[PDB]
Amino acid sequence: KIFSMLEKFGQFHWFYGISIGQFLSCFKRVFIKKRVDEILWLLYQEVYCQFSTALDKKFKMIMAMTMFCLYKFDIESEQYKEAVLTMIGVLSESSDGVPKLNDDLRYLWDYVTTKSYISALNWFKNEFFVDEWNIADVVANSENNYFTMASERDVDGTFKLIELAKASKESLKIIPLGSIENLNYAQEEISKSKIEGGWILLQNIQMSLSWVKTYLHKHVEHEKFKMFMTCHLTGDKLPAPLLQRTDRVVYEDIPGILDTVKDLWGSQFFSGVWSVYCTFLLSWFHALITARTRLVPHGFSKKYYFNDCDFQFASVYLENVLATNSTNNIPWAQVRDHIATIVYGGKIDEEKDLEVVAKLCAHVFCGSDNLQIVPGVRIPQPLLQQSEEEERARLTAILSNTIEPADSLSSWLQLPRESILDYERLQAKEVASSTEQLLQE
Amino acid sequence: TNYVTTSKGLTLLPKSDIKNLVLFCDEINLPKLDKYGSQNVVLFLRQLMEKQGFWKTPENKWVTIERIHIVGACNPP
Amino acid sequence: IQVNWVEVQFYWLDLYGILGENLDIQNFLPLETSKFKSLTSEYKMILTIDSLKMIKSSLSTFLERQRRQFPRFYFLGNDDLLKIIGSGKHHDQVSKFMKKMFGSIESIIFFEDSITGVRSVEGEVLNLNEKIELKDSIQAQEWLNILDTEIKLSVFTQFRDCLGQLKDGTDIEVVVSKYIFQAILLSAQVMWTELVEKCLQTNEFSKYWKEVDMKIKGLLDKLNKSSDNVKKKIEALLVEYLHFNNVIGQLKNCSTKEEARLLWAKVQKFYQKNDTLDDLNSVFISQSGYLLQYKFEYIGIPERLIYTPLLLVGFATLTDSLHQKYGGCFFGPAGTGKTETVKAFGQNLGRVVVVFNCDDSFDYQVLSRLLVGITQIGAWGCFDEFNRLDEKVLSAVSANIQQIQNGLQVGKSHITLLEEETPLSPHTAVFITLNPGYSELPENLKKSFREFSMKSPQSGTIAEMILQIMGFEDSKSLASKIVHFLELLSSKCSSMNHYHFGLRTLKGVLRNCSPLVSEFGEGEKTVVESLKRVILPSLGDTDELVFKDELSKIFDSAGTPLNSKAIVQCLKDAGQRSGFSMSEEFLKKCMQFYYMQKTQQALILVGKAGCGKTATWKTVIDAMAIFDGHANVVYVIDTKVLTKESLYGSMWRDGLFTSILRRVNDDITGTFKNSRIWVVFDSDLDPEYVEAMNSVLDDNKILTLPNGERLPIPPNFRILFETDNLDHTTPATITRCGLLWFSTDVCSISSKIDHLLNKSYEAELDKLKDLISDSFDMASLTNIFTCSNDLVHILGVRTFNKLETAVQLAVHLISSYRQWFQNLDDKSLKDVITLLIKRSLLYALAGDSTGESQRAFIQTINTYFGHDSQELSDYSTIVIANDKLSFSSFCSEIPSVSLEAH
Ligand SMILES: Nc1ncnc2c1ncn2[C@@H]1O[C@H](COP(=O)(O)OP(=O)(O)OP(=O)(O)O)[C@@H](O)[C@H]1O
Ligand SMILES: Nc1ncnc2c1ncn2[C@@H]1O[C@H](COP(=O)(O)OP(=O)(O)O)[C@@H](O)[C@H]1O
Numbered sequence A: 001k002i003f004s005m006l007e008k009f010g011q012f013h014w015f016y017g018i019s020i021g022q023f024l025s026c027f028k029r030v031f032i033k034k035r036v037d038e039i040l041w042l043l044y045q046e047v048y049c050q051f052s053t054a055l056d057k058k059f060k061m062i063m064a065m066t067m068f069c070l071y072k073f074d075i076e077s078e079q080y081k082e083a084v085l086t087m088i089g090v091l092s093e094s095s096d097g098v099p100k101l102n103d104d105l106r107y108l109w110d111y112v113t114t115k116s117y118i119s120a121l122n123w124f125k126n127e128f129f130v131d132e133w134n135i136a137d138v139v140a141n142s143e144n145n146y147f148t149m150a151s152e153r154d155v156d157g158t159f160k161l162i163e164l165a166k167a168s169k170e171s172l173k174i175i176p177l178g179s180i181e182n183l184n185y186a187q188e189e190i191s192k193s194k195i196e197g198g199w200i201l202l203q204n205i206q207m208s209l210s211w212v213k214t215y216l217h218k219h220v221e222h223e224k225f226k227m228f229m230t231c232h233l234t235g236d237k238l239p240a241p242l243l244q245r246t247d248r249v250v251y252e253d254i255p256g257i258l259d260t261v262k263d264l265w266g267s268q269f270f271s272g273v274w275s276v277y278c279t280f281l282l283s284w285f286h287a288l289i290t291a292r293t294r295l296v297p298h299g300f301s302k303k304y305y306f307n308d309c310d311f312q313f314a315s316v317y318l319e320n321v322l323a324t325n326s327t328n329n330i331p332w333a334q335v336r337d338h339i340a341t342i343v344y345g346g347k348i349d350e351e352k353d354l355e356v357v358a359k360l361c362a363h364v365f366c367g368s369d370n371l372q373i374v375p376g377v378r379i380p381q382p383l384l385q386q387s388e389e390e391e392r393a394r395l396t397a398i399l400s401n402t403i404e405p406a407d408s409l410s411s412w413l414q415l416p417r418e419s420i421l422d423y424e425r426l427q428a429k430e431v432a433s434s435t436e437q438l439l440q441e
Numbered sequence B: 001t002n003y004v005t006t007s008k009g010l011t012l013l014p015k016s017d018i019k020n021l022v023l024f025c026d027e028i029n030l031p032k033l034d035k036y037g038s039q040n041v042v043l044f045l046r047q048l049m050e051k052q053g054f055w056k057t058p059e060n061k062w063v064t065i066e067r068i069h070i071v072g073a074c075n076p077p
Numbered sequence C: 001i002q003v004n005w006v007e008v009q010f011y012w013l014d015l016y017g018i019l020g021e022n023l024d025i026q027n028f029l030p031l032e033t034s035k036f037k038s039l040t041s042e043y044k045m046i047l048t049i050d051s052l053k054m055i056k057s058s059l060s061t062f063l064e065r066q067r068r069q070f071p072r073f074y075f076l077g078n079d080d081l082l083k084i085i086g087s088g089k090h091h092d093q094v095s096k097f098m099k100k101m102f103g104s105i106e107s108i109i110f111f112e113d114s115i116t117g118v119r120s121v122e123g124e125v126l127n128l129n130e131k132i133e134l135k136d137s138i139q140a141q142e143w144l145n146i147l148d149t150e151i152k153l154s155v156f157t158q159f160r161d162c163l164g165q166l167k168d169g170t171d172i173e174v175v176v177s178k179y180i181f182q183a184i185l186l187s188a189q190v191m192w193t194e195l196v197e198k199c200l201q202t203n204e205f206s207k208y209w210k211e212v213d214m215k216i217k218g219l220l221d222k223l224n225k226s227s228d229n230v231k232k233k234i235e236a237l238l239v240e241y242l243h244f245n246n247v248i249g250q251l252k253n254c255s256t257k258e259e260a261r262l263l264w265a266k267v268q269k270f271y272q273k274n275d276t277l278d279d280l281n282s283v284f285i286s287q288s289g290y291l292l293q294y295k296f297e298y299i300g301i302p303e304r305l306i307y308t309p310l311l312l313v314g315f316a317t318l319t320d321s322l323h324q325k326y327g328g329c330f331f332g333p334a335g336t337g338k339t340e341t342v343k344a345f346g347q348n349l350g351r352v353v354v355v356f357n358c359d360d361s362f363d364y365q366v367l368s369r370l371l372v373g374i375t376q377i378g379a380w381g382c383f384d385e386f387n388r389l390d391e392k393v394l395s396a397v398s399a400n401i402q403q404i405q406n407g408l409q410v411g412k413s414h415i416t417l418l419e420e421e422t423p424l425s426p427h428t429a430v431f432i433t434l435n436p437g438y439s440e441l442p443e444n445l446k447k448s449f450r451e452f453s454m455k456s457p458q459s460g461t462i463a464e465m466i467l468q469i470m471g472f473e474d475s476k477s478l479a480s481k482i483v484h485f486l487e488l489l490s491s492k493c494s495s496m497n498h499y500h501f502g503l504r505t506l507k508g509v510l511r512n513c514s515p516l517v518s519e520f521g522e523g524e525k526t527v528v529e530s531l532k533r534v535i536l537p538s539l540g541d542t543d544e545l546v547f548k549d550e551l552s553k554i555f556d557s558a559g560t561p562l563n564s565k566a567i568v569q570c571l572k573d574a575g576q577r578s579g580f581s582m583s584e585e586f587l588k589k590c591m592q593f594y595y596m597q598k599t600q601q602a603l604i605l606v607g608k609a610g611c612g613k614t615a616t617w618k619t620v621i622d623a624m625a626i627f628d629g630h631a632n633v634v635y636v637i638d639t640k641v642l643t644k645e646s647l648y649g650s651m652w653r654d655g656l657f658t659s660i661l662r663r664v665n666d667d668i669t670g671t672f673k674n675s676r677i678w679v680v681f682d683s684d685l686d687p688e689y690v691e692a693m694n695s696v697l698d699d700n701k702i703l704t705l706p707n708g709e710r711l712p713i714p715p716n717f718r719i720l721f722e723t724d725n726l727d728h729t730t731p732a733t734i735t736r737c738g739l740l741w742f743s744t745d746v747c748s749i750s751s752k753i754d755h756l757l758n759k760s761y762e763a764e765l766d767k768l769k770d771l772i773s774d775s776f777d778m779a780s781l782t783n784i785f786t787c788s789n790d791l792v793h794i795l796g797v798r799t800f801n802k803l804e805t806a807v808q809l810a811v812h813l814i815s816s817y818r819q820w821f822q823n824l825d826d827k828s829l830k831d832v833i834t835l836l837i838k839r840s841l842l843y844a845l846a847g848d849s850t851g852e853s854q855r856a857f858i859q860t861i862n863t864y865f866g867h868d869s870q871e872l873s874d875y876s877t878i879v880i881a882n883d884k885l886s887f888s889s890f891c892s893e894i895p896s897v898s899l900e901a902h
């Protein structure tokens, strides 16, 4: 039954195709770790812990709820099955009714009734499945030496692997792809590392897919040697034998906005004081718009991708504006127009999203005496008699002092709470509908 | 047929002098449409049957046909 | 082996002219030159063509160095470049084929064996700063590079003395008649930038706004009484003078200085460096604070785009992309003006953008060839419709521009593009236009490109400025009316495939409004009448009803009829000459075709099978011959009967269209100089047959042959088309050529019957004709044809198209009894006539139906022709006895047969 569910998972997306031998080795891991009821429980726990990391967050929740449903259908009675199916029906807005009453069921009733969709979806994961696997547990407890990792755009797990470079004290060789010189360099370094070892990372193999059709198909137990392949979940279809022969991992983006501000601000190494202030405001605006982008039905109309190239272009524009101004009269309207129209709003074809970007630019680049940039923190303007390093210290101190609230998706991004509640309702509805379609078959 | 030059430029004539000629075309449905949805043969026959002649390819002259008939039998499409 | 010997002789002579005559070029490939000398000696002593082809393939490195000497000569193909190189002393075929290197430059005006001036495609003449001596011993590439530098410095010094004349206080009407459009345009831009900056140093804008208003009025007053090329120059310059007027008017209306600074930073500003010792790099452009370099390349007098704010936004984003050496990208629905925006940005910087029309016919080799050419020159390459390539060539081209942009960003001196080391000019840029929504940019390209989604252009502003240039006194409100009417038509009419109410159609309306002013005047009536002439023929029936309704509602003019009674009378004379009857709809279609062929050269006539296309255009031809007294030469050429090699030519035997065009161009007998010549493509519309002659359809009016011949087309050489569907026709050719649509047949049943009867008569005689015509009474015929329309016919053909048999059989049967008509009574004659007409109607209308349905139609015929008429039995016939004809059956005609065993 679990393998039928996982095959149905792999039918939806090309990255989730599971092999039979993988499932049998996963079952062997149950006895590897250290009566029939305990074996079955360990089977469910081990299958979830191993095959969750190859799935995105929505499919993680769908898989967890489906395994919980199957195990509680076998173990518990018919009334439990009816109650759980009513919970799924009211989550998907298909069937309505109070549960037939158990602390877990009344906690689930509190979650569903108080419109806590994320809590209702994560209750299964919190209650049943205990162990959770990060990147390091996946890479350490795997006999395979070839790893394929996929993600959406505007996120990249490569620095995380750089963190893993300090986890196991191994040198990571990062290889970009896209040109014939880079292709020859990648082939030479692959041929070197297949003998001398060392961790090799391949960045965004997707545009070299034809070369993947040429080399890796002909190329796919050394010490301290693991090869990592990074691709995109929304990109083109990777070959099935390449996917089956490599351990598949999905990396998930951060849930914080202030972390993005700190990450952008910690890479700006210099320019006077106003350049520092403009770069800080640009980092804040970039973090706010990128956080707003992920709420696809409500925060925007489509799924745009404002990568670091837009940040570089806007930073170059701010540097050119500040350089050609000797009176220290910053043209706030000019930079607002060029950022909301040319830099960030250029790729946007819709008008409502362009208005969203224009409103965000007007809120951020207003250049008032004091800019309450979120409901939390207000930024005063720089003084006329300070050094640049003092300004960096002041801005780092004001980032460290502020605290991201739990409702940062509403207050910091300027969205109504009704929109976020409706987005969570849609997410829980799609999760419960997919789980229902799995359970009825 | 023979190519003669008597009046109105060139003229295609049957070899016989009294009996007319009939161009039998079995299965006129069978010629295939090209990649752009047209059949060369039926347009050639339309030129012969309506314009009473045809344009030659290698030296670009108009041939006039006066007593050659066209019949053809075909199944439904 | 005569053809092989001729080919060997031609190859040997060409290669001898290329390499043998000239010294100090044989040291690169001594083995190849020795092999060529041995082959030439063998050919002189005496299949030898494969060895010469292999030698010329091995001489590609020498050819590569020859192209590296002057990279503009890289643009031509290998064959034509070899043709130029072999002619090292005649100095011919060079000036006639440089439109593909220099873009907008056509020919050279050279006198006394020296270079005097140059001539663009549009016809503008540029006089060089100094003459260049031309000698036979001088190689082509040296004087070519000298001429390129000379024309660039001549453009620079014409710009300089235009600036001197304008700064001296002289009027523009004396300088607009002397120097080229580029020089006066750039001088005007520089002076306008300086004047607006001086006015921005203060708080007054009115007096220079009035000055540029008087300047616009002066250009218009010079425009209305000037020559054709001078008219083109004044219109092109009036585009940017209206732009300057708009910019100054916007700056005057600003409430605060912040808005003025913002709007001045948004628009393009032109500055000249007065201290650098360099010449071509002394003028730059500021936009939104970003700097770009003017190239001083010749452009001529092009079609200047109207500077709408979204065009300036596209300019701003292209400048922002090129500031950090990033590529350019535009995407969106077709018709938003992306390629023209790229071209206008390029030619606004005084340089020519090389355009690659991406399609499946464009293979990898030619695309990479043009790409390495444009990156070794320094030109700007724009890929139009990049998403029209197969996966392998898409990936290869994507990698090519990826590594080009990677070299450009890092400031690499040279690039190993296409596995050879080539120079990388820092001024090379690549732009891509896309039409998504039916893919998108690849990942490698999108990592180094700036995508921009430019919106639908402001049709109101564009139409208003075009009308203002054309001299309409009410331009803004009229342009708003035109764009609102086109929006109403696009929102209310049917969703037909060939309907196009975009900016191309509006600009076609405004272009066709220009010949009509001499008979309608600058007013709303001209717009209404041209709108009719270019929109009405392409619509259906209810669509014409909607067009008329919204034309009477939106536009105030009710469409008064013009004075065209003489042409209508000539049309009716031709119709009664050829037997055609003039209904209101046939007259409408004939007049629409006539008015369309007054202006547009290439006409397309579309309708159902046998709807009346050939009759319509032949009647118009006859009427125009009667009206003008002008000769007709018609070449009815079926498009799909002849193949591509036979229609045009195969590599040399001339094809039919090429042969007749050469014959009409030569005009040995002089008959074609006083005649109208018509080519009628009476077959289906083929992309591979129309796209082979794009250069004839556009304003170039030049046919380009595979061997390189450029044949002119006379203005009276009017092309026609005659098809039945438009599902395999590109929207470009639909907008390029005039289009006439036959929504309904141009006849009645009785009119076609009368014409067929007259044709059969022409192919007691008058009494017989009267009896036949009177027996075809309309009251019974209409009912019997409606009854036949409800039957089931194999291979369903319209009853209308069946009429051509029903008449043609019937009269002939009566003709077969022309020797038995003086020996019978009137009643017997009427019975015979009725019986023969019944038989012909049976075997024409229901003759393609089953036997039971044929008998049912026999019963219907007998009931609808009355019981007084002779009843056509199901097996009846007329036999000839020894003295007189009689009515019998086919039962007595059956011969008993005796067959042997084997
Ligand atoms: N004004 C008219 N009065 C009477 N008959 C007419 C008139 N105009 C056309 N016809 C008839 O229409 C018939 C259709 O032939 P025509 O040459 O017009 O076809 P077409 O438009 O070239 O058709 P296709 O190209 O599809 O074969 C002619 O044979 C002619 O008898
Ligand atoms: N600012 C403008 N001024 C004048 N004409 C314009 C302008 N913008 C667009 N056009 C017209 O719009 C027409 C459609 O352009 P098109 O060739 O369809 O571009 P694309 O193929 O990139 O969509 C062009 O013929 C051009 O003349």
Ligand SMILES: [Mg+2]
Pocket (backbone or CB within 6 Å): C338, C339, C340, C384, C385, C433
């Ligand atoms: Mg285009």
Ligand SMILES: [Mg+2]
Pocket (backbone or CB within 6 Å): C613, C614, C682, C722
């Ligand atoms: Mg026809």
